[PDB]
Amino acid sequence: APDIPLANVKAHLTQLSTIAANNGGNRAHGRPGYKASVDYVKAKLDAAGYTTTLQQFTSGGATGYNLIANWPGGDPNKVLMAGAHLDSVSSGAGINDNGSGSAAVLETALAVSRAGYQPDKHLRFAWWGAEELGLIGSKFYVNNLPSADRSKLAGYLNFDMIGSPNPGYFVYDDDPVIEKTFKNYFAGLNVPTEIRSDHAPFKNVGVPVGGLFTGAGYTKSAAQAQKWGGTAGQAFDRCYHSSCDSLSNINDTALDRNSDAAAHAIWTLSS
Ligand SMILES: [Ca+2]
Ligand SMILES: [Zn+2]
Ligand SMILES: [Zn+2]
Numbered sequence: 001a002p003d004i005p006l007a008n009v010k011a012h013l014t015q016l017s018t019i020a021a022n023n024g025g026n027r028a029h030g031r032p033g034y035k036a037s038v039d040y041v042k043a044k045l046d047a048a049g050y051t052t053t054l055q056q057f058t059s060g061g062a063t064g065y066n067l068i069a070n071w072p073g074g075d076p077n078k079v080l081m082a083g084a085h086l087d088s089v090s091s092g093a094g095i096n097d098n099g100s101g102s103a104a105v106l107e108t109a110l111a112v113s114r115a116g117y118q119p120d121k122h123l124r125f126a127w128w129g130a131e132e133l134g135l136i137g138s139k140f141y142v143n144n145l146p147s148a149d150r151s152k153l154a155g156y157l158n159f160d161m162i163g164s165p166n167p168g169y170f171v172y173d174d175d176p177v178i179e180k181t182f183k184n185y186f187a188g189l190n191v192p193t194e195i196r197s198d199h200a201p202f203k204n205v206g207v208p209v210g211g212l213f214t215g216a217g218y219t220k221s222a223a224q225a226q227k228w229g230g231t232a233g234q235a236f237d238r239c240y241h242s243s244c245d246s247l248s249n250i251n252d253t254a255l256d257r258n259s260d261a262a263a264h265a266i267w268t269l270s271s
Pocket of ligand 1: 003004005006260
């Protein structure tokens with residue numbers, strides 16, 4: 001798998017930051033900052049050769065969208081998917097939650113194209129809307145896939161809040177093979193890992209799932225600061241769901257590591 005360049009990930013974050021600033025300060029469902037986020041991501045993927053689909057739905061009286069991107073090629077009967085919700089709460093720009101996950105998945109999708117990668121499993125990436133309203137977008141996606149298509153999913157990897165300013169390195173403990181893949185990646189860097197989001201709808205229907213997370217409103221412990229650095233007794237993300245979840249609410253090292261891990265997993269699991 002290629003190394004994902006942190007600068008590129010950060011450049012998407014800067015774009016999302018400006019979009020929020022230009023649309024009232026947030027990128028929430030039913031507000032213009034959301035649609036403007038989808039437009040940016042879609043434009044980057046279309047230029048890269050992906051086939052993109054906008055799936056629209058209505059929730060709480062307003063229209064939301066999911067953006068689905070398929071990389072032409074691969075076994076149609078074995079699809080590996082990776083996703084991240086693209087909406088924020090309305091208090092702010094949602095840079096760490098979840099511009100971090102969204103930009104990492106986007107840069108991994110562009111890396112696929114730049115590398116001319118031809119995986120064995122078909123690759124599909126998704127950016128979910130209205131996660132903050134109760135996983136509405138990912139639930140809509142899953143509820144609307146026919147049984148036959150669902151049984152084609154080989155796995156779903158979720159990235160939600162992967163750049164927390166006082167980070168932990170947590171791996172989802174669901175499918176063991178996915179889980180191991182990520183653990184192994186961290187082991188090679190010599191970073192220890194320890195064991196509410198879009199993966200739920202898929203897990204509920206039997207699709208193997210996994211993912212990475214750097215921590216939210218819980219307090220980092222002494223032992224955790226010992227293993228990862230940062231500040232014990234402070235939340236992993238002091239600006240969770242706050243107006244302060246802006247560009248300076250990102251820890252570059254965590255973001256870079258998690259982005260590279262995502263690419264390593266997607267390469268690894270798609271072959
Ligand atoms: Ca990197
Ligand atoms: Zn989130
Ligand atoms: Zn959230």
